[PDB]
PDB file of C-alpha atoms and ligand atoms in Angstrom:
ATOM      1  CA  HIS A   6     -45.872  33.050 -22.774  1.00  0.00           C
ATOM      2  CA  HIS A   7     -46.086  31.519 -19.307  1.00  0.00           C
ATOM      3  CA  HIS A   8     -43.489  28.718 -19.640  1.00  0.00           C
ATOM      4  CA  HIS A   9     -40.580  30.221 -17.639  1.00  0.00           C
ATOM      5  CA  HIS A  10     -38.323  27.071 -17.756  1.00  0.00           C
ATOM      6  CA  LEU A  11     -38.312  26.597 -13.976  1.00  0.00           C
ATOM      7  CA  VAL A  12     -38.673  22.872 -14.680  1.00  0.00           C
ATOM      8  CA  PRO A  13     -37.288  20.345 -15.420  1.00  0.00           C
ATOM      9  CA  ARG A  14     -34.467  20.651 -12.841  1.00  0.00           C
ATOM     10  CA  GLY A  15     -30.800  19.629 -12.675  1.00  0.00           C
ATOM     11  CA  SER A  16     -29.671  16.464 -11.007  1.00  0.00           C
ATOM     12  CA  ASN A  17     -26.596  14.539 -10.185  1.00  0.00           C
ATOM     13  CA  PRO A  18     -25.630  11.823 -12.603  1.00  0.00           C
ATOM     14  CA  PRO A  19     -25.783   8.210 -11.572  1.00  0.00           C
ATOM     15  CA  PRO A  20     -22.742   7.356  -9.537  1.00  0.00           C
ATOM     16  CA  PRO A  21     -19.944   5.108 -10.756  1.00  0.00           C
ATOM     17  CA  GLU A  22     -20.642   1.399 -10.486  1.00  0.00           C
ATOM     18  CA  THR A  23     -19.377  -0.491  -7.489  1.00  0.00           C
ATOM     19  CA  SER A  24     -20.461  -3.920  -8.736  1.00  0.00           C
ATOM     20  CA  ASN A  25     -20.313  -5.573 -12.086  1.00  0.00           C
ATOM     21  CA  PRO A  26     -20.682  -9.359 -12.206  1.00  0.00           C
ATOM     22  CA  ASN A  27     -19.072  -9.695 -15.609  1.00  0.00           C
ATOM     23  CA  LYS A  28     -16.005  -7.596 -14.757  1.00  0.00           C
ATOM     24  CA  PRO A  29     -12.843  -9.642 -14.094  1.00  0.00           C
ATOM     25  CA  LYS A  30     -11.791  -9.463 -10.396  1.00  0.00           C
ATOM     26  CA  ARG A  31      -8.993 -10.759  -8.195  1.00  0.00           C
ATOM     27  CA  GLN A  32      -7.799 -10.559  -4.673  1.00  0.00           C
ATOM     28  CA  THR A  33      -4.128  -9.591  -4.471  1.00  0.00           C
ATOM     29  CA  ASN A  34      -1.659  -8.552  -1.822  1.00  0.00           C
ATOM     30  CA  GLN A  35      -1.453  -5.068  -3.317  1.00  0.00           C
ATOM     31  CA  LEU A  36      -5.249  -4.655  -3.347  1.00  0.00           C
ATOM     32  CA  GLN A  37      -5.571  -5.807   0.317  1.00  0.00           C
ATOM     33  CA  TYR A  38      -2.939  -3.189   1.180  1.00  0.00           C
ATOM     34  CA  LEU A  39      -4.848  -0.562  -0.821  1.00  0.00           C
ATOM     35  CA  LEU A  40      -7.894  -1.159   1.375  1.00  0.00           C
ATOM     36  CA  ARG A  41      -6.382  -1.818   4.818  1.00  0.00           C
ATOM     37  CA  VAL A  42      -3.648   0.852   4.607  1.00  0.00           C
ATOM     38  CA  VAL A  43      -4.123   3.351   1.771  1.00  0.00           C
ATOM     39  CA  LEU A  44      -7.858   3.888   1.659  1.00  0.00           C
ATOM     40  CA  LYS A  45      -8.427   3.536   5.440  1.00  0.00           C
ATOM     41  CA  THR A  46      -5.738   6.058   6.340  1.00  0.00           C
ATOM     42  CA  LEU A  47      -6.956   8.652   3.861  1.00  0.00           C
ATOM     43  CA  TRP A  48     -10.581   8.017   4.866  1.00  0.00           C
ATOM     44  CA  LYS A  49      -9.965   8.912   8.522  1.00  0.00           C
ATOM     45  CA  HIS A  50      -8.064  12.118   7.606  1.00  0.00           C
ATOM     46  CA  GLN A  51      -9.695  15.444   8.479  1.00  0.00           C
ATOM     47  CA  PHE A  52      -9.446  16.473   4.824  1.00  0.00           C
ATOM     48  CA  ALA A  53     -11.254  13.410   3.485  1.00  0.00           C
ATOM     49  CA  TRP A  54     -14.812  14.607   3.733  1.00  0.00           C
ATOM     50  CA  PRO A  55     -15.227  16.352   0.337  1.00  0.00           C
ATOM     51  CA  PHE A  56     -13.923  13.111  -1.231  1.00  0.00           C
ATOM     52  CA  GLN A  57     -15.946  10.483   0.749  1.00  0.00           C
ATOM     53  CA  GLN A  58     -18.910  10.371  -1.659  1.00  0.00           C
ATOM     54  CA  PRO A  59     -19.813  11.134  -5.253  1.00  0.00           C
ATOM     55  CA  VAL A  60     -19.863  14.885  -5.734  1.00  0.00           C
ATOM     56  CA  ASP A  61     -23.350  16.154  -4.857  1.00  0.00           C
ATOM     57  CA  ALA A  62     -23.370  19.056  -7.298  1.00  0.00           C
ATOM     58  CA  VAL A  63     -27.015  19.872  -6.387  1.00  0.00           C
ATOM     59  CA  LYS A  64     -26.374  20.215  -2.611  1.00  0.00           C
ATOM     60  CA  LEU A  65     -23.068  21.981  -3.044  1.00  0.00           C
ATOM     61  CA  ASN A  66     -24.450  24.424  -5.591  1.00  0.00           C
ATOM     62  CA  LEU A  67     -21.826  23.440  -8.189  1.00  0.00           C
ATOM     63  CA  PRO A  68     -23.974  23.326 -11.318  1.00  0.00           C
ATOM     64  CA  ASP A  69     -20.944  23.318 -13.612  1.00  0.00           C
ATOM     65  CA  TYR A  70     -19.258  20.355 -11.936  1.00  0.00           C
ATOM     66  CA  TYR A  71     -20.502  17.518 -14.212  1.00  0.00           C
ATOM     67  CA  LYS A  72     -20.170  19.835 -17.240  1.00  0.00           C
ATOM     68  CA  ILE A  73     -16.433  19.925 -16.565  1.00  0.00           C
ATOM     69  CA  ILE A  74     -15.832  16.535 -14.926  1.00  0.00           C
ATOM     70  CA  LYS A  75     -16.889  13.654 -17.171  1.00  0.00           C
ATOM     71  CA  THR A  76     -15.016  10.922 -15.268  1.00  0.00           C
ATOM     72  CA  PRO A  77     -16.088  11.468 -11.621  1.00  0.00           C
ATOM     73  CA  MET A  78     -14.471   9.427  -8.904  1.00  0.00           C
ATOM     74  CA  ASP A  79     -14.439   9.531  -5.129  1.00  0.00           C
ATOM     75  CA  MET A  80     -13.205   7.551  -2.161  1.00  0.00           C
ATOM     76  CA  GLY A  81     -16.696   6.276  -1.223  1.00  0.00           C
ATOM     77  CA  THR A  82     -16.831   4.590  -4.619  1.00  0.00           C
ATOM     78  CA  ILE A  83     -13.216   3.306  -4.233  1.00  0.00           C
ATOM     79  CA  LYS A  84     -13.967   2.000  -0.711  1.00  0.00           C
ATOM     80  CA  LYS A  85     -17.031   0.119  -1.939  1.00  0.00           C
ATOM     81  CA  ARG A  86     -15.146  -1.235  -4.968  1.00  0.00           C
ATOM     82  CA  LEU A  87     -12.364  -2.544  -2.666  1.00  0.00           C
ATOM     83  CA  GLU A  88     -14.915  -4.044  -0.239  1.00  0.00           C
ATOM     84  CA  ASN A  89     -16.632  -5.733  -3.179  1.00  0.00           C
ATOM     85  CA  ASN A  90     -13.363  -7.027  -4.672  1.00  0.00           C
ATOM     86  CA  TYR A  91     -14.221  -5.122  -7.885  1.00  0.00           C
ATOM     87  CA  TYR A  92     -10.671  -4.668  -9.113  1.00  0.00           C
ATOM     88  CA  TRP A  93      -8.460  -7.008 -11.156  1.00  0.00           C
ATOM     89  CA  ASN A  94      -5.177  -5.407  -9.981  1.00  0.00           C
ATOM     90  CA  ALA A  95      -3.714  -2.556  -8.007  1.00  0.00           C
ATOM     91  CA  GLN A  96      -3.367  -0.374 -11.103  1.00  0.00           C
ATOM     92  CA  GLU A  97      -7.108  -0.181 -11.617  1.00  0.00           C
ATOM     93  CA  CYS A  98      -7.619   1.048  -8.035  1.00  0.00           C
ATOM     94  CA  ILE A  99      -4.689   3.485  -8.155  1.00  0.00           C
ATOM     95  CA  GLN A 100      -6.039   4.912 -11.393  1.00  0.00           C
ATOM     96  CA  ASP A 101      -9.292   5.621  -9.555  1.00  0.00           C
ATOM     97  CA  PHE A 102      -7.406   7.628  -6.914  1.00  0.00           C
ATOM     98  CA  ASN A 103      -5.451   9.440  -9.635  1.00  0.00           C
ATOM     99  CA  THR A 104      -8.750  10.343 -11.387  1.00  0.00           C
ATOM    100  CA  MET A 105     -10.160  11.689  -8.151  1.00  0.00           C
ATOM    101  CA  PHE A 106      -7.169  13.937  -7.529  1.00  0.00           C
ATOM    102  CA  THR A 107      -6.913  15.054 -11.171  1.00  0.00           C
ATOM    103  CA  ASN A 108     -10.597  16.004 -11.179  1.00  0.00           C
ATOM    104  CA  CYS A 109      -9.977  18.245  -8.180  1.00  0.00           C
ATOM    105  CA  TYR A 110      -7.035  19.990  -9.823  1.00  0.00           C
ATOM    106  CA  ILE A 111      -9.002  20.487 -13.059  1.00  0.00           C
ATOM    107  CA  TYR A 112     -12.132  21.839 -11.454  1.00  0.00           C
ATOM    108  CA  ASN A 113     -10.707  24.222  -8.824  1.00  0.00           C
ATOM    109  CA  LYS A 114      -7.911  26.828  -8.724  1.00  0.00           C
ATOM    110  CA  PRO A 115      -4.477  26.465  -7.084  1.00  0.00           C
ATOM    111  CA  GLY A 116      -4.653  27.725  -3.487  1.00  0.00           C
ATOM    112  CA  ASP A 117      -8.366  26.976  -3.071  1.00  0.00           C
ATOM    113  CA  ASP A 118      -9.041  25.169   0.241  1.00  0.00           C
ATOM    114  CA  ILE A 119     -10.201  22.061  -1.629  1.00  0.00           C
ATOM    115  CA  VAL A 120      -6.955  21.994  -3.617  1.00  0.00           C
ATOM    116  CA  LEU A 121      -4.925  22.287  -0.377  1.00  0.00           C
ATOM    117  CA  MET A 122      -6.883  19.299   0.869  1.00  0.00           C
ATOM    118  CA  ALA A 123      -6.317  17.233  -2.244  1.00  0.00           C
ATOM    119  CA  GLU A 124      -2.592  18.097  -2.211  1.00  0.00           C
ATOM    120  CA  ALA A 125      -2.248  16.833   1.361  1.00  0.00           C
ATOM    121  CA  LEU A 126      -4.210  13.687   0.689  1.00  0.00           C
ATOM    122  CA  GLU A 127      -2.219  13.074  -2.502  1.00  0.00           C
ATOM    123  CA  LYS A 128       1.049  13.478  -0.622  1.00  0.00           C
ATOM    124  CA  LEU A 129      -0.090  10.856   1.888  1.00  0.00           C
ATOM    125  CA  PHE A 130      -1.363   8.633  -0.928  1.00  0.00           C
ATOM    126  CA  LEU A 131       2.029   8.769  -2.697  1.00  0.00           C
ATOM    127  CA  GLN A 132       3.904   7.976   0.544  1.00  0.00           C
ATOM    128  CA  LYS A 133       1.716   4.960   1.206  1.00  0.00           C
ATOM    129  CA  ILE A 134       1.987   3.871  -2.523  1.00  0.00           C
ATOM    130  CA  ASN A 135       5.767   3.785  -2.100  1.00  0.00           C
ATOM    131  CA  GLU A 136       5.371   1.039   0.540  1.00  0.00           C
ATOM    132  CA  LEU A 137       3.124  -1.133  -1.628  1.00  0.00           C
ATOM    133  CA  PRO A 138       4.130  -4.793  -1.333  1.00  0.00           C
ATOM    134  CA  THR A 139       6.423  -5.840  -4.243  1.00  0.00           C
ATOM    135  CA  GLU A 140       5.558  -9.535  -3.758  1.00  0.00           C
TER     136      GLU A 140
HETATM  137  C1  EFN B   1     -17.805  27.084  -0.536  1.00  0.00           C
HETATM  138  O1  EFN B   1     -17.799  25.654  -0.355  1.00  0.00           O
HETATM  139  C2  EFN B   1     -16.633  25.112   0.093  1.00  0.00           C
HETATM  140  C3  EFN B   1     -15.493  25.826   0.444  1.00  0.00           C
HETATM  141  C4  EFN B   1     -14.376  25.133   0.911  1.00  0.00           C
HETATM  142  C5  EFN B   1     -14.426  23.748   1.036  1.00  0.00           C
HETATM  143 BR1  EFN B   1     -12.931  22.798   1.679  1.00  0.00          BR
HETATM  144  C6  EFN B   1     -15.552  23.053   0.730  1.00  0.00           C
HETATM  145  C7  EFN B   1     -16.705  23.732   0.296  1.00  0.00           C
HETATM  146  S1  EFN B   1     -18.126  22.801  -0.084  1.00  0.00           S
HETATM  147  O2  EFN B   1     -17.823  21.414   0.234  1.00  0.00           O
HETATM  148  O3  EFN B   1     -19.318  23.389   0.609  1.00  0.00           O
HETATM  149  N1  EFN B   1     -18.302  23.006  -1.726  1.00  0.00           N
HETATM  150  C8  EFN B   1     -17.328  22.552  -2.559  1.00  0.00           C
HETATM  151  C9  EFN B   1     -16.862  21.230  -2.571  1.00  0.00           C
HETATM  152  C10 EFN B   1     -15.932  20.890  -3.504  1.00  0.00           C
HETATM  153  C11 EFN B   1     -15.422  21.729  -4.452  1.00  0.00           C
HETATM  154  C12 EFN B   1     -15.847  23.064  -4.476  1.00  0.00           C
HETATM  155  C13 EFN B   1     -16.800  23.434  -3.509  1.00  0.00           C
HETATM  156  O4  EFN B   1     -17.283  24.749  -3.471  1.00  0.00           O
HETATM  157  N2  EFN B   1     -14.477  21.271  -5.412  1.00  0.00           N
HETATM  158  C14 EFN B   1     -14.384  19.927  -5.610  1.00  0.00           C
HETATM  159  O5  EFN B   1     -13.551  19.527  -6.419  1.00  0.00           O
HETATM  160  C15 EFN B   1     -15.218  19.022  -4.803  1.00  0.00           C
HETATM  161  C16 EFN B   1     -16.573  18.794  -5.425  1.00  0.00           C
HETATM  162  C17 EFN B   1     -14.503  17.700  -4.528  1.00  0.00           C
HETATM  163  O6  EFN B   1     -15.435  19.586  -3.489  1.00  0.00           O
END
């Protein structure tokens, strides 16, 4: 038999939403800080690049990635959500960052370059979180 299962192919899943008209949203001091300070400082960091977009498992030849990671998250998505005022409070945005970092620690092994990157970005994240406005 001449069906060799070379098709259909893999794909990336649809990315997380960055808009949702029926989701409750607010602008708050803490969320403005999360954009202007937290996100924009991490974004410009030389370790940000693996985290600036939804994981392209096809390009990166990581065919197990979405088998293991069922709650993907990335800073491109977070940036767009903040630009679009998607969040109700700071907790929802912080949880997105925590998901991103946790995914990295699940998927990879301690000492991998990508884990060293996430650790540095997380350290910076936590330092900036400690100066969140308390008004
Ligand atoms: C061999 O690919 C590497 C090696 C080191 C680094 Br740093 C980055 C790459 S890659 O970007 O070409 N592939 C790659 C990217 C990864 C990961 C593993 C990779 O091989 N692990 C991850 O958690 C995500 C998806 C965020 O980033």
